[PDB]
């Protein structure tokens, strides 16, 4: 048991900071990602380096309103994280990609 006489750190922060918007940086523009959108129904994104697949799956769902099937996670030779996100069968990955542009 322990109980301090005052709060030590009184000031709580202003927002989440480690946010849904700052986990997912934005989409990747390459020739490989163009094929994986059309063929496999599978998007690609730059991600925060400390973000897990559990964090990405929830954060992808809150923004675009589509629950992903799988998430598979590279860390590149540029030392930023890349997330291959497979969408389910109903939604098309071109239709989600056209909204973002």
């Amino acid at each position: 048991p322990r109980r301090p006489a005052f709060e030590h750190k009184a000031v709580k922060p202003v927002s989440l900071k480690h946010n849904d918007y700052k986990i997912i940086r934005g989409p990747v523009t390459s020739d490989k990602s163009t094929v994986k959108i059309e063929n496999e129904n599978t998007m690609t994104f730059w991600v925060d380096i400390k973000a897990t697949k559990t964090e990405i799956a929830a954060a992808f769902n809150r923004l675009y309103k589509v629950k992903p099937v799988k998430v598979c996670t590279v860390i590149t030779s540029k030392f930023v994280k890349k997330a291959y996100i497979r969408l389910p069968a109903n939604v098309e990955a071109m239709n989600i990609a056209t909204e973002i542009g």
Partner: peptide, 11 residues
């Protein structure tokens, strides 16, 4: 901010 960070790759 987030929508513009998406479109800076494309446009």
């Amino acid at each position: 901010l987030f929508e513009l960070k998406g479109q800076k790759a494309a446009s």
